[PDB]
C-alpha cells in the first residue's frame, strides 16, 4: 500500500547544478547532464562512476537514451544537440538549427528520430543517421519545457511556459490537440504514460495533473509539493505499486498514490531544489538530482 524507498547511494562529481537524470532502457546505467557542460555515466545499481562525456560549449539541460542503450542525445545552451556513441564517447553528430537554448530532447522508440524543444519556442524533428532537421513545428509562443514521443512514435507531446500542452502527429507535423485547463499556468514538464493513453504535466502553481489526452479531460490531481520556478521532471513509477514521483523546490522527493492522489512518501536528503527524478525500468529504484548548492545525485530503493 506504501513504498519504503530509503537512501542507498550518493553520487558526487558534477561541479555545477545537475539538470537531469535518466536510466538507460536496459537498466544498467544512469546518465546525467549538468550546467557544468558535462554528461556523466554511472552504474544504475551501485552508483559507481563510469565515464565523463564532453564536447558541449555551454551547460546542458537534458539528456536521453536510445532504445538500445548505446546512444545518447543531449540538449544544451550552446544552441545545439549532440548525438553520442556511449561506449566510445565520440560525438557522432551535432544538430544545428535552434536559435537559442535547447531545453529538452528524446528519441522515438524506433530511435531513428530525435525530437527537441527550445527556448526559441520551436519543436524540431531530427533524423538520427544524417543529423538533418526533418521538420520544424511552430509549437508555442514561449519556451518549450518538455518533449516526448508516445509508445509508438506516432505522436509527440510538448509543453511550454505559454501554458499549453500540444499533441502533434509525427508523420505530418500537424497539431492534433491543445490542452486547455481553467487558468493555463506555465507548463514546466510533460510526458506520456507508458501505454501512451494519458499524459502527466506539471504546472508552475504547485500542481501535477493526469490528463486523458483524447477526451482532453484532466482526471487525477497531485499537490502538496512545491513547484513555482523550475522545470522539475516527474514520473510514472510502475515496477512495484503505482506511484507518481516528482522533484520539489523544498529539497524533498515526493511520492504519490497514483489513484488516491495521497502522498505516500517524502524522501529527505538533498540540500537544494530537486530538479529531476527517474525510475528504473524494472527495479524499484529511484534516481534524484539537485541544483547548484547540492550537486549530488542520489539513488533510493524500496521493496514495494
Amino acid at each position: 500500500v506504501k513504498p519504503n524507498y530509503a537512501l542507498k547511494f550518493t553520487l558526487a562529481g558534477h561541479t555545477k547544478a545537475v539538470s537531469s537524470v535518466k536510466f538507460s532502457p536496459n537498466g544498467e546505467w544512469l546518465a546525467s547532464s549538468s550546467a557544468d557542460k558535462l554528461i556523466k555515466i554511472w552504474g544504475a545499481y551501485d552508483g559507481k562512476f563510469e565515464k565523463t562525456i564532453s564536447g558541449h560549449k555551454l551547460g546542458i539541460s537534458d539528456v536521453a537514451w536510445s532504445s538500445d542503450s548505446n546512444l545518447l542525445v543531449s540538449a544544451s545552451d550552446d544552441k545545439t544537440l549532440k548525438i553520442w556513441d556511449v561506449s566510445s564517447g565520440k560525438c557522432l553528430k551535432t544538430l544545428k538549427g535552434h536559435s537559442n537554448y535547447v531545453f529538452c530532447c528524446n528519441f522515438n522508440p524506433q530511435s531513428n528520430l530525435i525530437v527537441s524543444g527550445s527556448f526559441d519556442e520551436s519543436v524540431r524533428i531530427w533524423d538520427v543517421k544524417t543529423g538533418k532537421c526533418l521538420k520544424t513545428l511552430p509549437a508555442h509562443s514561449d519556451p518549450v519545457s518538455a518533449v516526448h514521443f508516445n509508445r509508438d512514435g506516432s505522436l509527440i507531446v510538448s509543453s511550454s511556459y505559454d501554458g499549453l500542452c500540444r499533441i502533434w502527429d509525427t508523420a505530418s507535423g500537424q497539431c492534433l490537440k491543445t490542452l486547455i485547463d481553467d487558468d493555463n499556468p506555465p507548463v514546466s514538464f510533460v510526458k506520456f504514460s507508458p501505454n501512451g493513453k494519458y499524459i502527466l504535466a506539471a504546472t508552475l502553481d504547485n500542481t501535477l495533473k493526469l490528463w486523458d489526452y483524447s477526451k482532453g479531460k484532466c482526471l487525477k490531481t497531485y499537490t502538496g509539493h512545491k513547484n513555482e520556478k523550475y522545470c522539475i521532471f516527474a514520473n510514472f513509477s510502475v515496477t512495484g505499486g503505482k506511484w507518481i514521483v516528482s522533484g520539489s523546490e523544498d529539497n524533498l522527493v515526493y511520492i504519490w498514490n497514483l489513484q488516491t492522489k495521497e502522498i505516500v512518501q517524502k524522501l529527505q536528503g538533498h540540500t537544494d531544489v530537486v530538479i529531476s527524478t527517474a525510475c528504473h525500468p524494472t527495479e524499484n529504484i529511484i534516481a534524484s538530482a539537485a541544483l547548484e548548492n547540492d550537486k549530488t545525485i542520489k539513488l533510493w530503493k524500496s521493496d514495494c
Partner: peptide
C-alpha cells in the same frame, strides 16, 4: 475519482 490504468496497452 475512478481507477486509471496507465501501463495496459490494449
Amino acid at each position: 475519482d475512478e481507477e486509471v490504468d496507465v501501463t495496459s496497452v490494449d
